[PDB]
Design a protein around this ligand. Structure first.
Ligand SMILES: Nc1ncnc2c1ncn2[C@@H]1O[C@H](COP(=O)(O)OP(=O)(O)O)[C@@H](O)[C@H]1O
Ligand SMILES: Nc1ncnc2c1ncn2[C@@H]1O[C@H](COP(=O)(O)OP(=O)(O)O)[C@@H](O)[C@H]1O
Ligand SMILES: Nc1ncnc2c1ncn2[C@@H]1O[C@H](COP(=O)(O)OP(=O)(O)O)[C@@H](O)[C@H]1O
Ligand SMILES: Nc1ncnc2c1ncn2[C@@H]1O[C@H](COP(=O)(O)OP(=O)(O)O)[C@@H](O)[C@H]1O
Lengths: 229, 229, 233, 233
């Protein structure tokens, strides 16, 4: 089993699903058996025991936006990912070759930490030749100046590295297309090679996203990086 | 209703309970009606939805160390604190005058954040003449050197201020007693007056703790600070 | 002297200068003697820079002003910054012979960056020396928005405000900068998730002329705020 | 050149010097040419200081080396730090005429303090220039213990390790310093809550003579570790 983990930076609604979706379609296009899974961290659940001087303890919980109960979430994530990845999908009746994992929330979210920890551990179980990750981050731009900015993505990538994952591709999302100078800064200040910086701007129909990925040699990259046929 | 909130710094098992307990006893000694309440944040509950490609969503939870369910924990904390504080205690049949609130966990704990937020908001509802807080922090000391350190407490106090509470007294806990130079540094680098730094070292029976507080003029302080009889 | 400190978040080119400038313009039109100090965190040598302040303290140390003692960023640089601000803020301006009543300090850089920390630390400490009613700070931060969705996002400002708080300053006003006007749902979300009242969230969108910035600031009662917060005549 | 960076956490006087020194002593006894660089974050002027490095770059700027450009802490100070480390690390020592194989860099200060950040940032970047097998970093941190309870606590080391990670370095060894020996329950808790294998948690308690420190380090297989981690002969 090969795995591609997709995470998000700086903001939510950054395009995690579309990137995972698109990577799925691209590889199926080359005749690979590909499965998708999503892990969505739940809006944090805040609890506590309240204790009056001389009367019973009330235990207060907190509604989220609204079922298995495990001892260790971290072990449960890695067991459930490994097992679902095997479940045959589409037709094809056989074990998938690539599993595209979609991690909801944004890197830096308090609620995401246990799941990022899960995958930090997992990358060493999977071994490097069968596991890579892709960080989808924002490059903002105010209309008043036109200047696209790399700082938010710089910081996001550092947060990600801090939590133990090194991004194999950085997907830079932006309103208008990214100019070579800014693409050069991302490469240089996030310490990845130029080819690992993929730029996907806002497009008028989703179909264009896979096309842009392919135009930026994503398949050649995944081929070397995961040893794919 | 007057309120004294007790929080902890740098480490757990810092002596929050003993300080709250001792403050309770001291004020009762002056004939005040005093009640105690404890809020203990629960070991964080990590959840998430897992989603296979073409099969039902499993929702995974996480055991803590093991009941009311509210929309906003922050509002629930402040309502429950205000109401319990009124409940007559000991004999005395009448509404307590002072409520000593004990906040479990340590400032900086992810799980403590909503409750510290609760009290940030609460200090403005209670108004300043009826609300103060007391931060019980560690001053460590290695046997190899003997040198007591203020940095952990400096940082703890900054974290506390960052979350919106300014400590009215800093209670410095340590293995051996604190020397004047270190007591001077705490005062100066945590930006409180000398009299707001109270030092309570490790003692051989709990009874000594209230005595040390009184020796360091805690009652004179609470008198001016809360307008007590 | 009363002091207003303008810092920026998330990105450079966020509008620190225009805000610093507009607050100045607004306050002068209510009859107040306003002065301006600019801090540039760069090393090149009423305007202070890392170069100038470090060269000053290095030179002092080098000729023995500190009597052999160990000289450190905190407190020696940070003392020099505070001593430098207080002395500049007193210098008469705009033709007046009397001491300025207010000093708007513009701190270049973006909060979170290493170059700016000596200055943020200087001001963390300075707010305790000044009374509360003689110092406040304003944080100018990005509310970004992809055209694909049109959703304004508050997370970057949340993380920026939390980092500022981390470094010891708590913003009295959060000026949210966006391409298009911030709507009330998003404006309340900033109030909620940063930890401030609604009236402390000031929204300043991209305008077609910068004279509109002080118009927008006055429209959101910034003078009422500063009167109460700094006790101004 | 291979580099080992020693940093400290929670408190000063935590043992950075003894660890830096003991690693050096241990590695020399396995036949390796070891050199030492000390960084002092103070401003006073193979030993570098904030004063020296800032004075150097200020002077360069002042005479026009950077051709009018804006000079900044990052990259100009941080470049100078990295250029300075590489050049010192090459200089022959201990009587040998050949280039040293390993350089132990001792960074004074405590992680989290402003004075140390230019240096931590220099090394965050430097670890990408060097190969992975030519750079690792060791973090010396406090496991405190009140006599009242006798409970060793890991939270301070957790927060310290997370702050180091925040500044862009991830410790390859956490050296936990305590008054009395750390027991296995607490040793596993550090492995768990910081995010590292058990063999990366090295415990060094207060001893009655500092020669015991390298004895304890070798007892916990630090050489085995460095052989694998830095690919050493
Ligand atoms: N490159 C793009 N161009 C235009 N719209 C996009 C692009 N990428 C994503 N979107 C749209 O933006 C929204 C957010 O995308 P989604 O994949 O759901 O993000 P996330 O998975 O991070 O929530 C969706 O409506 C999606 O169709
Ligand atoms: N000053 C002191 N001297 C000796 N023992 C103390 C002192 N303060 C607290 N203790 C003891 O240390 C332990 C922790 O105290 P506790 O109040 O339960 O801390 P917390 O409320 O922060 O958990 C208890 O066993 C308590 O009796
Ligand atoms: N609200 C706004 N609308 C349009 N343009 C703006 C606005 N605020 C700032 N600008 C412009 O953006 C650029 C950057 O502003 P500036 O104040 O120089 O930012 P900073 O001081 O943060 O670097 C300038 O051209 C400025 O006139
Ligand atoms: N494991 C230890 N046992 C006893 N004393 C120690 C130990 N480690 C360091 N020390 C002593 O503690 C003091 C501080 O050590 P040092 O290495 O100078 O700390 P730093 O370099 O972090 O300032 C010195 O007197 C040193 O000999």
């Amino acid at each position: 089993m090969k795995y591609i983990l997709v995470t998000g930076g700086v903001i939510s609604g950054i395009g995690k699903g579309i990137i995972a979706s698109s990577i799925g379609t691209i590889l199926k296009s080359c005749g690979l058996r590909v499965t998708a899974i999503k892990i969505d961290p739940y809006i944090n659940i805040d609890a506590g025991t309240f204790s009056p001087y001389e009367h019973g303890e009330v235990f207060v919980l907190n509604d989220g936006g609204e079922v298995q109960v495990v001892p260790h979430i971290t072990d449960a994530v890695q067991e459930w990912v490994m097992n679902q990845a095997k479940v045959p999908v589409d037709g094809n009746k056989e074990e998938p070759q690539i599993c595209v994992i979609e991690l909801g929330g944004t890197i830096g979210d308090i609620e995401g930490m246990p799941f990022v920890e899960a995958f930090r551990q997992f990358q060493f179980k999977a071994k490097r030749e069968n596991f890579c990750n892709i960080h989808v981050s924002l490059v903002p731009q105010l209309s008043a100046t036109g200047e696209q900015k790399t700082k938010p993505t710089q910081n996001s990538v550092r947060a990600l590295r801090g939590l133990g994952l090194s991004p194999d591709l950085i997907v830079c999302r932006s309103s208008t297309p990214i100019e070579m100078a800014v693409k050069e800064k991302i490469s240089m200040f996030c310490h990845v090679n130029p080819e690992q910086v993929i730029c996907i701007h806002d497009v008028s129909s989703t179909y264009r996203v896979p096309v842009l990925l392919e135009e930026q040699s994503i398949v050649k990259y995944f081929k070397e990086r995961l040893h794919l046929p």
